Design a protein around this ligand. Structure first.
Ligand SMILES: COc1cnc(C(=O)Nc2ccc(F)c([C@]34CN(c5ncc(F)cn5)C[C@H]3CSC(N)=N4)c2)cn1
Length: 390
């Protein structure tokens, strides 16, 4: 049974551009599309004209707006935003039937933040206060929602990748998945949910205990997999791996697929590869399994993704009927990031109340008739806390 019909299919967008939910801010309500980001903790919206914004938050038009008289500056690797802190009334039209007074960063300047044609105007940081800017005293949206309402302290995400390119028109008209606020919808997954502990409440931090490529153990010291952390992050496209893990994984993926040779630019994520329509050789590419620490002592489980997850469909540079893709596994110097590449395979339950993350095979994951994504267990694994980096 699906018990959250109101919230099923409330997401739009794709990998590379981002999955967003409709929200309203202010009185009278101002509608905005908001990127869902489990990898940050600020609620921040465009609040001034920008070339890539079709609309923005107008604080002067909101009778319920409150100025906190405080600036916020958020530099990150590939860009930045800055703005002014305030509070206002916020609702999610395809969400729980509640209105909350939440912190809002009104973005007045940004660099490489807004994406042309993504159709979103702001970001919903769903992680914990520890990583909020300017500091942990700025209560994140979800904490406000839970404190002010009877909504259970849990949300779940089904991100639905298309498996083929969507153009401007198609992304608008299409369903990109579900964010179920306050519950778990049984219609969004098949098989069992398996839970991994949230190691610490800042990012959604987890512990990977083993990595396999087509069943072959990558055979690295498990600390390497979590150096300097492993996180579940809907605001990142790629599966991102620590440098040494990336090198080892790519060598193994190349060996598994060695019946075809791909240029270095492909493996670096820089260059697309194209096949004649319908002929993508999925079967030459390996499955990838991540083993996660279980809830029971000395137990683990595994999640397994297909090339249909880690090869990202792209529109051809020279318009044709070819099926074209980029490699969406990449190097990290900030630990493992389980981005949309992982998340598109799975229904992911962010069980904040019980400090755990649940995984189940997504009812919308892309596959062929020969192989599917999997969530399987249990496995007997030892010394797993040792896999955590300090
Ligand atoms: C499913 O495919 C996807 C998913 N997401 C996107 C996308 O455009 N994400 C996005 C855009 C801007 C942005 F700033 C971010 C951030 C906000 N960050 C942040 N915010 C506050 C802070 F204190 C520290 N870092 C870091 C930064 C890069 S990684 C992340 N998780 N979130 C994500 C595209 N395709």
């Amino acid at each position: 049974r699906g018990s959250f019909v109101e919230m099923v299919d409330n997401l739009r967008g794709k990998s590379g551009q981002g999955y967003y939910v409709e929200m309203t801010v202010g009185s009278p309500p101002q509608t905005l599309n908001i990127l869902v980001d489990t990898g940050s903790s600020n609620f921040a919206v465009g609040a001034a004209p920008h070339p890539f914004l079709h609309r923005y938050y107008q604080r002067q038009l909101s009778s319920t707006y409150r100025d906190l008289r405080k600036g916020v500056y958020v530099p990150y690797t590939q860009g930045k935003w800055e703005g002014e802190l305030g509070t206002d009334l916020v609702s999610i039209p395809h969400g729980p039937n509640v209105t909350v007074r939440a912190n809002i960063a009104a973005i007045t300047e940004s660099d490489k933040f807004f994406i042309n044609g993504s159709n979103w105007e702001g970001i919903l940081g769903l992680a914990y206060a520890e990583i909020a800017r300017p500091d942990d005293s700025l209560e994140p949206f979800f904490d406000s929602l839970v404190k002010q309402t009877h909504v259970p302290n849990l949300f779940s995400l089904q991100l639905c990748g298309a498996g083929f390119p969507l153009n401007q028109s198609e992304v608008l008209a299409s369903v990109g998945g579900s964010m179920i606020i306050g519950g778990i919808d049984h219609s969004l997954y098949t098989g069992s949910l398996w839970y991994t502990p949230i190691r610490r409440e800042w990012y959604y931090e987890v512990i990977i205990v083993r990595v396999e490529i087509n069943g072959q153990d990558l055979k690295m010291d498990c600390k390497e997999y979590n150096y300097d952390k492993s996180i579940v992050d809907s605001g990142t496209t790629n599966l991102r791996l620590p440098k040494k893990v990336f090198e080892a994984a790519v060598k193994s993926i190349k060996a598994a697929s060695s019946t075809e040779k791909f240029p270095d630019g492909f493996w670096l994520g820089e260059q697309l590869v194209c096949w004649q329509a319908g002929t993508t050789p999925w079967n030459i590419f390996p499955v990838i399994s991540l083993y996660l620490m279980g809830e029971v002592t000395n137990q683990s489980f595994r999640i397994t993704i297909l090339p249909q997850q880690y090869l990202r469909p792209v529109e051809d540079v020279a318009t044709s009927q070819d099926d074209c893709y980029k490699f969406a596994i990449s190097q990290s110097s900030t630990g493992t990031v389980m981005g949309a590449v992982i998340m598109e395979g799975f229904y992911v339950v962010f069980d904040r109340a019980r400090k755990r993350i649940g995984f189940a095979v997504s009812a919308c994951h892309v596959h062929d008739e020969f192989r599917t994504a999997a969530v399987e267990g249990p496995f007997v694994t030892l010394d797993m806390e040792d896999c955590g980096y300090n």
